[PDB]
């Protein structure tokens, strides 16, 4: 890699975030403000997305 190369020959850093978006238990999680739990009422819910 030479700094005077044309853009297509210049170095690019690449990162590839690969998700195991499966039925398994979660450990990497979005910054959501969790609530107290509610039961026996009809409710909206979001468990681990």
């Amino acid at each position: 890699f030479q700094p005077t190369y044309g853009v297509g020959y210049q170095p690019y850093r690449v990162v590839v975030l690969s998700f195991e978006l499966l039925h398994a238990p979660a450990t990497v999680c979005g910054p959501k403000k969790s609530t107290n739990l509610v039961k026996n009422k009809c409710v909206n819910f979001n468990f681990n997305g």
Binding site: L22, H23, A24, P25
Partner: peptide, 24 residues
């Protein structure tokens, strides 16, 4: 040497609970 495996080597195919069902 060899022997018969019978029914052995079944495993839970995914981490989902299921009950009273014949899943395929």
């Amino acid at each position: 040497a060899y022997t018969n495996s019978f029914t052995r080597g079944v495993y839970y195919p995914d981490k989902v609970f299921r009950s009273s069902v014949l899943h395929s």
